[PDB]
Design an enzyme around this catalytic site. Structure first.
Site, PDB file in Angstrom:
ATOM      1  N   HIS A   6      28.408  36.575  38.758  1.00 50.46           N
ATOM      2  CA  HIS A   6      28.191  35.647  37.654  1.00 50.46           C
ATOM      3  C   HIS A   6      29.425  35.583  36.765  1.00 50.46           C
ATOM      4  O   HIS A   6      29.580  34.667  35.957  1.00 50.46           O
ATOM      5  CB  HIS A   6      26.965  36.058  36.840  1.00 50.46           C
ATOM      6  N   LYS A  62      33.830  37.261  36.748  1.00 50.45           N
ATOM      7  CA  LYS A  62      34.848  38.208  37.168  1.00 50.45           C
ATOM      8  C   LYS A  62      35.240  39.045  35.959  1.00 50.45           C
ATOM      9  O   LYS A  62      35.287  38.540  34.836  1.00 50.45           O
ATOM     10  CB  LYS A  62      36.065  37.497  37.764  1.00 50.45           C
ATOM     11  N   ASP A  64      40.929  51.345  31.237  1.00 50.29           N
ATOM     12  CA  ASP A  64      40.655  52.646  30.631  1.00 50.29           C
ATOM     13  C   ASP A  64      39.213  52.787  30.141  1.00 50.29           C
ATOM     14  O   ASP A  64      38.975  53.210  29.010  1.00 50.29           O
ATOM     15  CB  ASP A  64      41.638  52.935  29.492  1.00 50.29           C
TER      16      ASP A  64
HETATM   17 CL   LIG Z   1      37.243  34.806  40.553  1.00 53.73          CL
END
Ligand SMILES: [Cl-]
Length: 151
Positions: free
Chosen positions: A84, A86, A91
Protein backbone atom coordinates in the site's frame (compact mmCIF):
# COMPACT_ATOMS: atom_id res chain seq x y z
CA UNK A 1 7.36 16.67 -11.02
CA UNK A 2 9.35 19.32 -9.17
CA UNK A 3 8.28 18.19 -5.71
CA UNK A 4 9.50 14.70 -6.60
CA UNK A 5 12.94 16.19 -7.26
CA UNK A 6 12.91 18.06 -3.96
CA UNK A 7 11.64 15.03 -2.05
CA UNK A 8 14.22 12.69 -3.60
CA UNK A 9 16.90 15.22 -2.66
CA UNK A 10 15.70 15.21 0.96
CA UNK A 11 15.62 11.40 0.97
CA UNK A 12 19.13 11.05 -0.46
CA UNK A 13 20.24 13.50 2.23
CA UNK A 14 18.59 11.39 4.94
CA UNK A 15 20.28 8.25 3.62
CA UNK A 16 23.62 10.09 3.67
CA UNK A 17 23.10 10.63 7.40
CA UNK A 18 22.25 7.01 8.17
CA UNK A 19 24.48 5.74 10.98
CA UNK A 20 23.78 2.03 11.48
CA UNK A 21 20.93 0.71 9.35
CA UNK A 22 18.65 1.17 6.36
CA UNK A 23 15.63 -1.06 5.72
CA UNK A 24 13.98 -0.38 2.37
CA UNK A 25 10.70 -1.81 1.09
CA UNK A 26 10.01 -0.76 -2.49
CA UNK A 27 7.97 -2.05 -5.44
CA UNK A 28 10.22 -0.72 -8.20
CA UNK A 29 13.71 0.73 -7.80
CA UNK A 30 14.99 2.72 -10.77
CA UNK A 31 16.27 5.93 -9.17
CA UNK A 32 20.00 6.37 -9.75
CA UNK A 33 20.06 9.03 -7.03
CA UNK A 34 18.61 6.66 -4.44
CA UNK A 35 20.72 3.72 -5.62
CA UNK A 36 23.92 5.76 -5.36
CA UNK A 37 23.04 6.99 -1.86
CA UNK A 38 22.61 3.35 -0.85
CA UNK A 39 26.03 2.70 -2.38
CA UNK A 40 27.67 5.45 -0.33
CA UNK A 41 25.84 4.25 2.78
CA UNK A 42 27.09 0.70 2.20
CA UNK A 43 30.63 2.05 1.80
CA UNK A 44 30.11 3.94 5.06
CA UNK A 45 29.56 0.67 6.91
CA UNK A 46 25.77 0.93 7.09
CA UNK A 47 23.88 -2.38 7.11
CA UNK A 48 21.19 -2.29 4.41
CA UNK A 49 18.29 -4.63 3.65
CA UNK A 50 15.89 -4.45 0.70
CA UNK A 51 12.44 -5.97 0.15
CA UNK A 52 11.02 -5.80 -3.37
CA UNK A 53 8.94 -7.52 -6.05
CA UNK A 54 10.18 -10.62 -7.88
CA UNK A 55 9.03 -9.46 -11.31
CA UNK A 56 9.92 -5.77 -10.97
CA UNK A 57 13.42 -6.67 -9.75
CA UNK A 58 14.34 -7.77 -13.27
CA UNK A 59 12.49 -5.01 -15.12
CA UNK A 60 14.16 -2.18 -17.04
CA UNK A 61 15.80 -0.39 -15.65
CA UNK A 62 15.95 -1.77 -12.12
CA UNK A 63 18.79 -0.81 -9.77
CA UNK A 64 18.38 -4.00 -7.72
CA UNK A 65 20.96 -6.21 -9.45
CA UNK A 66 23.54 -3.42 -9.22
CA UNK A 67 22.99 -3.18 -5.46
CA UNK A 68 22.76 -6.92 -4.82
CA UNK A 69 26.15 -7.40 -6.49
CA UNK A 70 27.66 -5.10 -3.86
CA UNK A 71 26.51 -7.44 -1.10
CA UNK A 72 23.13 -5.87 -0.34
CA UNK A 73 20.69 -8.63 0.72
CA UNK A 74 17.51 -8.52 -1.37
CA UNK A 75 14.45 -10.63 -0.60
CA UNK A 76 11.29 -10.92 -2.71
CA UNK A 77 7.93 -12.44 -1.69
CA UNK A 78 6.19 -14.89 -4.02
CA UNK A 79 3.88 -13.95 -5.50
CA UNK A 80 3.57 -11.09 -5.97
CA UNK A 81 4.58 -8.26 -3.62
CA UNK A 82 1.54 -5.99 -3.32
CA UNK A 83 2.07 -3.03 -1.00
CA UNK A 84 0.00 0.00 0.00
CA UNK A 85 3.11 2.15 0.31
CA UNK A 86 6.85 2.02 -0.23
CA UNK A 87 8.94 2.90 2.82
CA UNK A 88 12.47 3.32 4.13
CA UNK A 89 13.56 2.96 7.76
CA UNK A 90 16.74 4.78 8.76
CA UNK A 91 18.26 3.73 12.10
CA UNK A 92 15.05 2.19 13.42
CA UNK A 93 15.28 1.71 17.19
CA UNK A 94 14.72 -2.05 17.28
CA UNK A 95 16.97 -2.58 14.26
CA UNK A 96 19.83 -0.57 15.75
CA UNK A 97 19.42 -2.42 19.05
CA UNK A 98 19.66 -5.80 17.34
CA UNK A 99 22.79 -4.61 15.53
CA UNK A 100 24.15 -3.77 18.99
CA UNK A 101 23.85 -7.44 19.91
CA UNK A 102 25.19 -8.74 16.60
CA UNK A 103 28.43 -6.75 16.60
CA UNK A 104 28.58 -6.82 20.41
CA UNK A 105 29.42 -3.11 20.45
CA UNK A 106 30.69 -1.68 23.73
CA UNK A 107 29.58 1.81 22.68
CA UNK A 108 26.82 3.33 20.54
CA UNK A 109 27.03 6.29 18.19
CA UNK A 110 24.06 8.56 18.93
CA UNK A 111 21.23 8.28 16.40
CA UNK A 112 17.45 8.28 16.01
CA UNK A 113 14.79 6.55 13.92
CA UNK A 114 13.59 8.17 10.70
CA UNK A 115 10.74 6.89 8.55
CA UNK A 116 10.31 7.88 4.92
CA UNK A 117 7.10 6.77 3.21
CA UNK A 118 5.43 7.41 -0.14
CA UNK A 119 3.03 6.07 -2.76
CA UNK A 120 3.89 2.95 -4.74
CA UNK A 121 4.66 3.52 -8.42
CA UNK A 122 3.59 0.45 -10.38
CA UNK A 123 4.91 1.36 -13.83
CA UNK A 124 12.44 7.31 -9.80
CA UNK A 125 9.21 8.90 -8.63
CA UNK A 126 8.64 9.67 -4.95
CA UNK A 127 5.11 11.07 -4.73
CA UNK A 128 3.15 11.51 -1.48
CA UNK A 129 6.47 11.50 0.38
CA UNK A 130 6.48 11.91 4.15
CA UNK A 131 9.56 12.13 6.37
CA UNK A 132 9.09 11.91 10.14
CA UNK A 133 10.90 10.80 13.30
CA UNK A 134 8.15 9.08 15.28
CA UNK A 135 9.03 5.78 16.94
CA UNK A 136 5.34 4.86 17.10
CA UNK A 137 5.33 4.82 13.30
CA UNK A 138 8.87 3.40 13.18
CA UNK A 139 8.11 0.28 15.23
CA UNK A 140 5.07 -0.46 13.05
CA UNK A 141 7.06 -0.22 9.81
CA UNK A 142 9.92 -2.27 11.29
CA UNK A 143 7.45 -4.97 12.32
CA UNK A 144 6.05 -5.14 8.79
CA UNK A 145 9.58 -5.24 7.41
CA UNK A 146 10.53 -8.03 9.81
CA UNK A 147 7.52 -10.03 8.64
CA UNK A 148 8.30 -9.85 4.91
CA UNK A 149 11.99 -10.45 5.62
CA UNK A 150 11.16 -13.80 7.21
CA UNK A 151 9.07 -14.94 4.24
CL1 LIG B 1 7.61 1.63 -5.52
Amino acid sequence: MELSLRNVAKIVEQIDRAVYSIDLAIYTFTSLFLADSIKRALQRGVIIRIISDGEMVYSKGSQISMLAQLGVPVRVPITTNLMHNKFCIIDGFERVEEIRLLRKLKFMRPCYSIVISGSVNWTGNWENCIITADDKLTATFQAEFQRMWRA
